[PDB]
């Protein structure tokens, strides 16, 4: 019964900066993976348990992904926003709830960011 | 009347244990998808407990009810020579299941080439030979002379024999079991996905739990006897009475009668197999 909560939405004009955040809550043994997905599902950012990051093809690495382990939090820093980035962004996570159990993921609600 | 209560209780317990250890063998020997190298070791443990609860325990029951050995002198040696071999074979069988699970967990992709059928059968034969040597080794080495009444059947209390038996039958496999399970628990804690799929991972993570339940029952049942015997044998000040001694070796027989209930409760193929065998 693990639930995720997102924060950091807004609506402004182009040429600005923002920061999104996602955080888990419930009974967890460990968390293994997080990420962010645009719009329709497509990868834009993903981090691991160790720290080896990765990115997507439609963005040329201009965003920044970071993870706080002790509070189970993942962030996203957006800067120099283009007018073609008006969509709905979603969070994700993977977890386990016991040492003798099965790996299973779980999505989140979503957040809206509008840019011109 | 006091013999009727003890007779009814011990007869009911023995008649439960024989049918349990026959049903465990039959449920594996009937079905076809339960044919692997791990389940044959469970069949071996069931064979050892079946021989114990069908040969040894009635004569100790009659000995406890009556109060004197009333069958002769030649049987007093055969009974005390089978009584050690059965328990030693059961403990070394548990140790080899622990070694098999360690090799299965730590190398999950090169398992069906390392643990073949031939090496499993040869390891079974080596375990039975080592048990038969280490059981009746010191029994014919610390041989003491016999009394002249022949209605009594007692056991040895030389400290060399007690030390050798307690060191070679209980405390030697226990260290191997604890080392293997410590390394296996650290690897299961530190890893994400074992065999490259979700289904093989969640199928591999449950047999280890079942064998933990079996080992946890066995240690709890057989520890106080092997902890109260050599202390009273070496230091003769803290020797206990003759009434608290008679429970710490009946717990070890209750273990053999209570073992075959673990498999239907903590599984879902064993329950279906037991119900399908009882259907006929
Ligand atoms: C001395 C160490 O042995 C063992 C060594 C290895 C494995 C098991 C060993 O031991 C098993 C328990 N073997 C009991 C102790 C013998 C026994 C049985 C019935 C009796 O009667 C009801 C009595 S008796 N003469 O005390 O009443 C003794």
Author numbering:
A (entry chain D): 3 to 41, 46 to 122
B (entry chain A): 24 to 235, 276 to 343
Task: Provide the authors' original text about this structure.
The α1A-adrenergic receptor (α1AAR) belongs to the family of G protein-coupled receptors that respond to adrenaline and noradrenaline. α1AAR is involved in smooth muscle contraction and cognitive function. Adrenergic receptors (ARs), which mediate physiological responses to the neurotransmitter noradrenaline (norepinephrine) and the hormone adrenaline (epinephrine), are family A G protein-coupled receptors (GPCRs). Here, we present three cryo-electron microscopy structures of human α1AAR bound to the endogenous agonist noradrenaline, its selective agonist oxymetazoline, and the antagonist tamsulosin, with resolutions range from 2.9 Å to 3.5 Å. Our active and inactive α1AAR structures reveal the activation mechanism and distinct ligand binding modes for noradrenaline compared with other adrenergic receptor subtypes.
